[PDB]
Fold this protein.
Amino acid sequence: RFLKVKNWETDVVLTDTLHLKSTLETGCTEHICMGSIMLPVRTKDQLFPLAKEFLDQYYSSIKRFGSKAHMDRLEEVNKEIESTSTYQLKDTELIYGAKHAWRNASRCVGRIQWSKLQVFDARDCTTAHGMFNYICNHVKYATNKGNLRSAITIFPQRTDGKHDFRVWNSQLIRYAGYKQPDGSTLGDPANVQFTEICIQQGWKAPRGRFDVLPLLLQANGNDPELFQIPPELVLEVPIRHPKFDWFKDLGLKWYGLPAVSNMLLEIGGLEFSACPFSGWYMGTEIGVRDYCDNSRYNILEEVAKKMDLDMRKTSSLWKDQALVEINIAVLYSFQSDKVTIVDHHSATESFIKHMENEYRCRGGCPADWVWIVPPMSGSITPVFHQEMLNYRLTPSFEYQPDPWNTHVWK
Amino acid sequence: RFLKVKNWETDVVLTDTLHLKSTLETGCTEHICMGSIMLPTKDQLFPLAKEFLDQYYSSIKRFGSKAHMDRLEEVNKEIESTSTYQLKDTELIYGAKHAWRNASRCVGRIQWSKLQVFDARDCTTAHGMFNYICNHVKYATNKGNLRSAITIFPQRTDGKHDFRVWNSQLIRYAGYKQPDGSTLGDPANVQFTEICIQQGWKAPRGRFDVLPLLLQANGNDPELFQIPPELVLEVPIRHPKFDWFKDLGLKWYGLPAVSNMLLEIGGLEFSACPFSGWYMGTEIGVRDYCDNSRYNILEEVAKKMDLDMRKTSSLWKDQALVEINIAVLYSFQSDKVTIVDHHSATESFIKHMENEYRCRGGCPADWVWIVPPMSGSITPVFHQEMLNYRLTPSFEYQPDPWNTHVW
Ligand code: HEM
Ligand code: HEM
Ligand SMILES: C[C@H](O)[C@H](O)[C@H]1CNc2nc(N)[nH]c(=O)c2N1
Ligand SMILES: C[C@H](O)[C@H](O)[C@H]1CNc2nc(N)[nH]c(=O)c2N1
Ligand SMILES: N=C(NCCC[C@H](N)CNCCN)N[N+](=O)[O-]
Ligand SMILES: N=C(NCCC[C@H](N)CNCCN)N[N+](=O)[O-]
Ligand SMILES: [Zn+2]
C-alpha cells in the first residue's frame, strides 16, 4: 500500500511505504484518532523473531543481507537465545540500533542529526558509582565547552526484570522543584516529586530557584544511589535580552545540555532501560515551555509587567508579545555564550529537509505533527503546513514507568 | 472501551464514551495515525434515518414514545415509497445545530445551540438563492454584532439536481495571476476568481475585491450576483501604535461564512448549506495575512518595523506576527465588529469540552485544528488531550462543483 502526505504550503506531495514495516500499535483505530494523547521480561518465543527482524535490518543496512556473516550471526543469536534466553549485541549493532531509535523517534524534530550520534557502550557497568562515572564522562563529552555533541550512554540491558539499570532522573540535568507549605513552588514545578525522592535519599537541597539536581542511579536492580555531578561539568547560561537591560535582572538561567534519561531503548527485542541521550536545545523548549508553561516557571506575567504591556485584556496579545521577547532572550544568551542552540525556524526548516530526504532514501519518516510543530508561531514554521504520518518503527525509544513506581526496595 | 483524556496543565482527566457511538471512519488504523492529514439506496437510508430520529426523540425526552414510533414508521413508509424523505422543521434545526456540535475542527462550538437556521428548502432558482444569501449575510452581520446562522437549501435527490454555492465562503477576496508571475489579491482564490471571469464577472483587478456569488440551483449552471456592497461589512486594519500600519492598505471582511461544505442529517444530504459565526483573530492575522501562500505580508511589516531580518534567530517573523495580529483585533474591535482572540476562544472551548463531557459523554475534537496557529502552548487547548472521531449529523467536505458540474 502507498500513502500520500501533502504540504499545503508548497503542494509538494510525498509517498510513504515505510509504514508497511510498522509493527507496533498506535493507539488509534478506524473509529478514533488518539493522535493528541501523550501516552496511549520477554520469552525466548517472541525474542528471536524480534532479533531476526533487527539483524536483517542491520545486515541490510551494511549491504551484507544474506551473507555468511549475516547467516552465522542469526544462528549465533538463535543458539544464544535458546542457550541463555537472551543475547548480546555486537558493538556495531548497538551503535546502529541506537542511531536508528533516534532516527525513528517520531516526536523528535532534530532528527536531521541522527547519523551523528556518539554512542558510549556502558554495558560492562555493574554499579551505581560506575554509572556515575559513565554519566560524568557523557556530560563532559557532550557539553564540549559549549560546542554540544550528540551522545548516548547505554547501560546493561534488562535480563529478568529484577536487575534493571535505571537513571531515576528524567533528564541528567534539571533544576530541583520545591513545594512550599503556602502552596507556591520554588524552582521547577515539574521536578517536585523527583526532588522529594532525592531529599529522602539523603540529598541536601540548597532550596534555590535553579539548583542542579543530583543523579539518582540504579544499577543491577539494586536500590538507587545519589551522586552530585561535578559543577564544573554543568554548563549554564545566564539569560539576558539584547535590548531589555532589565531582563537579566529576572535572575533567569538554564543548563545548556538537554539529556533525556528516563526512556527505554529497544533494539532487536532487547530492552535497555538506562540509556541517557543528549543533543542540544531548540530555543522554544526553554523560552516557551520551561519558562512560559503555566505549570513550569511561568514567567509570562513578570516579563509582561516589566515591558509595561496592557495586561487588562488578552486581546492586546501581551502574552504573545512577552513570549517572543523571552524567546529572543534565550537564543541571544546562548549564542552570546557560544553554547549550541537552534531556533524553531531553523530547526523546523531543517526537519522538513530531513523529512523529504528520508522519504526518498528510506520511503518515509514517521512524524508526530502534534510534537513536531513548535509551541509558538506554529503556522509561520513550515512543519505546520506539512502532513505527517505517525507510526512506530523499531529500534525505538519508548516511555517506561517511573522507577519509583515499580522498584522493589532492598 | 471507555477512553480517557487528560489535560497536562491541570491534570484533569475526562472519560469519553460518546466515541462509542461513532459510525464513520477516521482514516487512522492501529498501525498508522493520519491525524495531521487534512482530508483523509433506500436500504442505506432508513438505518441512517432511524439512527437520527432515535437520537432526536432521545433529545426531546420522547424516546420509545408513540410519537417516536409513528414518525419512525412514517419516514420508513416515505422512504420505501419515495426513496427519500423530508425532515420536519424541528428535525432540520436539531440536525443543523448538531452538525455544528459535532464539528471536531471547530473551536467555537460552545456557541453551537444558538444557531439561527434559515430553511431555504422551498428555494428553486439561483436568484432565489441570492435572495436567501443576502438575507443571511444581512442577518448574520447585524451591523457588526455578528449572529451565527446557516441557510439550508434543498437536499440532494438524484445527484443531478444538487444546489451548490461555488464560493468557498460567501465573502472572499479575488486573486489574479499577474504578468510579473506574482499574485494580486488572495492567492487562495485565484482559480475561483477565474471561473467567475470565465463566467462573465468583471474583475476590478484589485488587492481586495469582494468576489461575486456563483449560485447553482437544481443542478442548473451557476449564476453570478454581486452582494450588495452595503451588506458586506469590512474592517480597515490599523495598529494601535504604528501609525504607518494603515499605509499597508490592509483590510478584511467581518463575516466568515463557509459555503462549500455538505450538511448530513439522518442520511439526507444538503449540498448547499452556507453558515457563518464570527472570526477568531488568528484566522486573519496569522493565516490569511501571514501564510506564505496567502497575503504573505510578514516581510513588508518586518521592514516597516525596522528589525534585523538577517538572522531567523532574532525572531523578527515572530515579533512582526504578534503586531499584525494585535492590529487585526484592534481594527475589528475599534469598528465594533465581533471578533475573538485565540486566548479567549480556546478558553471557551476548554469550558465547552468539559460541558460536553459531563453532559454528552464527550466531545470529538481535532487537536491539530483546535490549537491556534500562533502561541500554541500558551493557550489551554495545547495541553488538552483530545479524541477525534466522526458523529452525525455532520459537516463534510465535498468536491468543488466545477470538477463535477456537467454544463
Ligand atoms: C541534535 C539536537 C536535537 C534537537 C534540536 C532535538 C529537539 C527535540 C525537541 C524540540 C524535542 C521535543 C522535546 C519536548 O517537547 O519535550 C525532542 C524530542 C525527542 N527527541 Fe530530539 N532533539 C535532538 C537530539 C536528540 C537525540 C540525541 C535523541 C536520541 C538519540 C533524540 C530523541 C528524541 C526523542 C525520543 C524525543 C521525544 C521524547 C519524549 O517523548 O519526551 N533527540 N527533540
Ligand atoms: C461563533 C463563531 C465561531 C467561531 C469563533 C469559530 C471558529 C472556528 C475556527 C477558528 C475554525 C478554523 C478555521 C480554519 O482554520 O479554516 C473553525 C472551523 C470550523 N467551524 Fe467554526 N466557528 C464559529 C462558528 C461556526 C458555525 C456557525 C459553524 C457551523 C454551523 C461552524 C463550523 C465549523 C466547521 C465545520 C469548521 C471546520 C471547517 C473546515 O474543515 O475547513 N463554525 N471554526
Ligand atoms: C495534549 C497534547 O498532546 C500535549 O500537550 C502535547 C502537544 N505537543 C507537544 N509537543 C512537544 N514538542 N512537546 C510536548 O510536551 C507536547 N505536549
Ligand atoms: C498539514 C496540517 O494538517 C495542516 O497544515 C493543518 C494544521 N492545523 C490547522 N488548523 C486550523 N484551524 N486550520 C488549518 O487550516 C490547519 N491546517
Ligand atoms: N532537544 C532535546 N529535547 C528533549 C529533552 C528536553 C525537553 N524540553 C524536556 N521534556 C520534559 C518531558 N515533558 N533533546 N536532545 O537530546 O537534544
Ligand atoms: N470562524 C469561522 N471560520 C471558518 C471559515 C474561515 C476560515 N478562516 C477559512 N478556512 C479555509 C479552509 N481551509 N467560521 N464561522 O462560521 O465563524
Ligand atoms: Zn490517529
